[PDB]
Amino acid sequence: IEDRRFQETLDKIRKEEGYDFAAIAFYESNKPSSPIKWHYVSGNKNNRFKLIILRKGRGLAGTVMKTGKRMVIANVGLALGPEEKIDAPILLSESLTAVLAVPLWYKNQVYGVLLFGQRDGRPLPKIFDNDDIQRKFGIFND
Numbered sequence: 001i002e003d004r005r006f007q008e009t010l011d012k013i014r015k016e017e018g019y020d021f022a023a024i025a026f027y028e029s030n031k032p033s034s035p036i037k038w039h040y041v042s043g044n045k046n047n048r049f050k051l052i053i054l055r056k057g058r059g060l061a062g063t064v065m066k067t068g069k070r071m072v073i074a075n076v077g078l079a080l081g082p083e084e085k086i087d088a089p090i091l092l093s094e095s096l097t098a099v100l101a102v103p104l105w106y107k108n109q110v111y112g113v114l115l116f117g118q119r120d121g122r123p124l125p126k127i128f129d130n131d132d133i134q135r136k137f138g139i140f141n142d
């Protein structure tokens with residue numbers, strides 16, 4: 001899709017799927033040492049996410065960017081240690097208690113990571129299978 005649609009589609013999907021929060025991360029630049037940052041957000045409580053710097057292979061977005069595998073964390077407090085909590089600062093800046101992170105694809109590469117989150121102990125609305133993934137979030141792929 002055109003770059004000029006990412007925000008609108010992100011917001012609509014967040015609301016359809018019933019999440020408190022959504023975001024999308026990409027590499028900050030084409031420089032070799034580029035970090036990964038959270039480029040778009042929706043349902044965010046503040047702007048501190050703009051300070052977050054993720055090194056390659058680290059946090060939620062780094063791991064999904066690397067592995068090609070979605071991550072489902074039903075409960076942050078139970079599923080993650082404090083070392084993992086630290087690699088994923090969006091958890092802290094947005095007070096997220098559950099999350100779903102999905103890779104977005106371009107010619108078999110992961111070019112971005114799409115994150116959905118809940119606050120206040122609200123559960124994930126549903127755990128999607130591979131086909132629902134593709135159907136609901138395939139708009140972001142080619």
Ligand SMILES: [Cl-]
Nearest residue numbers: 059088089090
């Ligand atoms: Cl993060």
